């Protein structure tokens, strides 16, 4: 039976650590993939970590120049949560350099984008069988969430982008039922930019918090129902979530232009007028991570928050982050549990290696007592292949 | 649930990439088999990749001189599709230097040929239990498809060859039910040559497109029903599919002699009078791969096609290719879905290594939009063991 989605996000106070794979520490000697962009998606029985391999193992000569995102060798795989991605415990999902995946309560839906930059095609697999394809409609780099898509009531929803990365692009919302795209609308969002959305279900609707890579240092959001009837805007909290970003000050509900023309994939959870903001500690580089609770940060432009919880330290590398939920048919509760994952990038651009890779940590929100610490990557670089 | 097989091939306009294992890129550091001649066969629940190991791991001293096809150390194994063949995730099937395997909807049937050249014996396993054996009847190299056999209605059919590789040989069609050979006929095909057939079911009959290694630069075919009542011929299309082959020109329905006295295993799908031809891009070496759609290429010798789709670039190595289908009990559709796989050979006879191996890619035909690209092997040779 499919997952209903009629439940609201559970009440939280803090985040308790869920998993940690130690991929790069293990991959020094073991046979571990050179991955990037992991994400966690939960079925009604388990939770899996999906990652985009570079086609090569870590500490190997084929990992040379794996800073590049688009190659014909990247594939989407999955391993059980908290385990290092190795060829001996990973399940092959799709051939993709951009991907997303989610579970409707019956079978896994996998979306995988591969092909040339001006002709990329998304191959939709349902239960491992190719069911539909979506071709690029602007003949620019076609890209998708890099995190889980959201099913409510048997229908999974996803957002894709096609167009310039420094200007106005084309944004589409797709409604997918058992691998068939049954409905899609193209968002009319002038002067907005949406990339790498992180979507979660809430009260039967879908809420996506995306990355503004053009002229915004706060984050844009889009909310829609099962009819793909949408609303758009930005998070008005003066506690900016993007990276690079300015120092905290008076925020805005339109794009924040200052120091905003790039970004990193992130997330946020809406609790009435409040928001749980997950952002890096440094305003210039992807170092650190914290969770901010602004009780009025969805509609007010103040810069005053209520609670901070520390995840990594300003001295340790961090990377992409995204949100997933655990449906009541998995946890047994009466509400949807909000969780999130963080990617800890080690290697190039910043470090003097030949490769770039990332391990992951993940946290789940609880209503009991929690503590803030630093759970860094812990890998000691450079490796043997760099010498 | 034995397969019904009364279904006809699905209508398709292109091919969407299904899998890619990156075996040789991973095998540089990981423990990955030295395989060759992979093929994909699907059950009613999953699809598996069958391969013929050389008995040794890649980048090891026992991979020395693995260009040879017949040795007492070769075995047939299988791994889930899209995963690198390693001893830690592979299932042992049979001891063979020539093999084929297919699933009747209840259990796997495995055929494995091993033994001396003048006395080779095929050992038929059903559900892992030896059920029957077929001994060479011409005391020459006995050989089989190297791709999946075809079941329609609980009976799997296969084609075997025994005799000279540069002259007239002996060709037999076998009808196998639950591991017992219940019927077999020897084809009366003078001036023809059949090797390494790739068979698929279509409308309750079986269609095999084989390799002419004696005197045909086009491909021969044999079609038969469940009574083993057969028809023979060649693909008339002036777009030759074998390799080596002449340049495209006026073609033939009988053997094409020019530049034809060798070949490579290939395939083709018959759509009325049309044909989907899968062939290498270069006419002299196994480099490249494309899919040609000749709307009248099964009976007319024109040399004029309608659609090309690019799979690998003429600058990248390719190898064997074959056809498999996904039955309606797997896909849930009402047609038999045509798919195909390609083997990407790296190593000797054309690289300066001590070993030869091959990874694989696979595509499935869809009626939606698709794109042509190049998905090459991507391995950086030579390895450490070659130094």
């Amino acid at each position: 039976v499919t997952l209903a989605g009629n439940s609201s996000l559970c009440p939280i106070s803090g985040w308790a650590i869920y998993s940690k794979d130690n991929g790069i520490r293990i991959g020094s000697k073991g046979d571990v993939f050179v991955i990037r962009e992991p994400f966690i998606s939960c079925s009604h029985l388990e939770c899996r970590t999906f990652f985009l391999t570079q086609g090569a193992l870590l500490n190997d000569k084929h990992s040379n120049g794996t800073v590049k995102d688009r190659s014909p060798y990247r594939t989407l795989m999955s391993c059980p949560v908290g385990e290092a991605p190795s060829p001996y415990n990973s399940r092959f999902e799709s051939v993709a350099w951009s991907a997303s995946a989610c579970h409707d309560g019956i079978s896994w839906l996998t979306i995988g984008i591969s092909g040339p930059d001006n002709g990329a095609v998304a191959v939709l697999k349902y239960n491992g069988i190719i069911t539909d394809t979506i071709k690029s409609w602007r003949n620019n780099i076609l890209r998708t969430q890099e995190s889980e898509c959201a099913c409510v009531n048997g229908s999974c929803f996803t957002v894709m982008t096609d167009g310039p990365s420094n200007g106005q692009a084309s944004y589409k919302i797709f409604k997918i039922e058992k691998g068939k795209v049954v409905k899609s609308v193209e968002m009319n969002a002038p002067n907005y930019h949406y990339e790498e959305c992180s979507c979660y279900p809430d009260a039967g609707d879908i809420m996506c918090v995306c990355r503004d890579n053009w002229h915004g240092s706060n984050r844009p959001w889009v909310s829609f129902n099962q009819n793909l009837e949408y609303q758009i805007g930005y998070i008005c909290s003066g506690i900016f979530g993007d990276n690079p970003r300015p120092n905290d000050g008076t925020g805005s509900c339109s794009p924040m232009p200052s120091n905003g023309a790039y970004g990193v994939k992130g997330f946020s959870f809406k609790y009435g007028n409040g928001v749980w903001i997950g952002r890096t500690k440094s305003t210039s580089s992807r170092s650190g991570f914290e969770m901010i609770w602004d009780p009025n940060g969805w509609t007010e432009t103040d810069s005053s928050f209520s609670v901070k919880q520390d995840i990594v330290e300003i001295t340790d590398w961090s990377g992409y982050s995204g949100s997933f939920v655990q449906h009541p048919e998995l946890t047994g509760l009466d509400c949807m549990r909000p969780c999130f994952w963080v990617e800890l990038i080690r290697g190039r651009p910043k470090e003097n290696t030949i490769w770039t890779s990332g391990s992951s940590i993940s946290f789940c929100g609880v209503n009991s007592d929690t503590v803030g610490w630093s759970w860094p990557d812990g890998a000691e670089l450079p490796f043997t292949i760099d010498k | 649930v034995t397969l019904a097989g009364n279904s006809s091939l699905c209508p398709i306009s292109g091919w969407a990439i299904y899998s890619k294992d990156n075996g040789i890129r991973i095998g540089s550091k990981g423990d990955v088999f030295v395989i060759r001649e992979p093929f994909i066969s699907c059950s009613h629940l999953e699809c598996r990749t069958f391969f013929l190991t050389q008995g040794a791991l890649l980048n090891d001293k026992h991979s020395n001189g693995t260009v040879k096809d017949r040795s007492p150390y070769r075995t047939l194994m299988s791994c889930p599709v899209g995963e690198a063949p390693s001893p830690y995730n592979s299932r042992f099937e049979s001891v063979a230097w020539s093999a084929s395997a297919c699933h009747d909807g209840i259990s796997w049937l495995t055929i494995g040929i091993s033994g001396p050249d003048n006395g080779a014996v095929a050992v038929l396993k059903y559900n892992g239990i030896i059920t029957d054996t077929i001994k060479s009847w011409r005391n020459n190299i006995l050989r089989t498809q190297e791709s999946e056999c075809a079941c329609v209605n609980g009976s799997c059919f296969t084609v075997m060859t025994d005799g000279p590789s540069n002259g007239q040989a002996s060709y037999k069609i076998f009808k196998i039910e639950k591991g017992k050979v219940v019927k077999s006929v020897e084809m009366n095909a003078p001036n023809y040559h059949y090797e390494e057939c790739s068979c698929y079911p279509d409308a309750g009959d079986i269609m095999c497109v084989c390799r002419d290694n004696w005197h045909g630069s086009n491909r021969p075919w044999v079609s038969f029903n469940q009574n083993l009542e057969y028809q023979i011929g060649y693909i008339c299309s002036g777009i030759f599919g074998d390799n080596p082959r002449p340049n495209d020109g006026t073609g033939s329905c009988s053997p094409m002699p020019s530049n034809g006295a060798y070949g490579v295993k290939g395939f083709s799908f018959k759509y009325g009078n049309g044909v989907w031809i899968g062939r290498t891009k270069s006419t002299s070496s196994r480099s490249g791969f494309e899919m040609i759609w000749d709307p009248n290429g099964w009976t007319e010798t024109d040399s004029s096609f309608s659609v090309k789709q690019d799979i690998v670039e003429i600058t990248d190595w390719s190898g064997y290719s074959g056809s498999f289908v996904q039955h309606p009990e797997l896909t849930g559709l009402d047609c038999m879905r045509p798919c195909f796989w390609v083997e990407l050979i790296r190593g000797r006879p054309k690289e300066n290594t001590i070993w030869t191996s091959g990874s694989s890619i696979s595509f499935c035909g869809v009626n939606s939009d698709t794109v042509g690209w190049s998905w090459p092997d991507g391995a950086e040779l030579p390895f450490t063991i070659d130094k």
Partner: antibody
Amino acid sequence: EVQLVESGGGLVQPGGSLRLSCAASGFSFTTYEMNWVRQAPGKGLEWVSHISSRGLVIYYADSVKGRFTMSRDTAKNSLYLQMDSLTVADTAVYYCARHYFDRDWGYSGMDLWGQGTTVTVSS
Amino acid sequence: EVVLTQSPGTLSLSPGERATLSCRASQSLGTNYLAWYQHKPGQSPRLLIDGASTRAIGIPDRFSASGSGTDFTLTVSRLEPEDFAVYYCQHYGNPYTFGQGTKLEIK
């Protein structure tokens, strides 16, 4: 194992026309952006033109805009440059260079070059 | 338009001491997209520093670079006989320009 080889340079009189060709090996144009860079004898490097991996020509130098034409053939992995109405200031040595646009980090920087071809104008 | 000015037009040193080369941007550069190239006569240019702070693949630890806003610096702690060439600073963000270069030769 990746290579870019320019060809086509020679002696041409003023006001003539010419066309260079950079053949690339080991990589596909459908992923990397390409560039024409020229060095005049006695001057520094100058960025002539820049074409995307999507086939859009992003940049022309101010001096050469309206006169040069940059194109490519992806099925052949070839990059071309048609110069028309050549002047005496177009004497230089030309390179075809390659860089990358990363979806996350952005542009990368010209990583791989050729030796280049000399274009000289006499009388 | 943004012009990049390398302060030392020519710079001569002995084989084995610190060499500091510099570029000054006319207008601040919001993009952190500035690279350094080494051009030896008779050979193609080579990428040394990318992102104004990071050595490329295969470039030795000998080179280093730093900068902020309009100031950018390339430092070679210990020169070598093969370390003498022309050094360029490039802005590959909008607008696309190169610098004028600086020649290092044995004194």
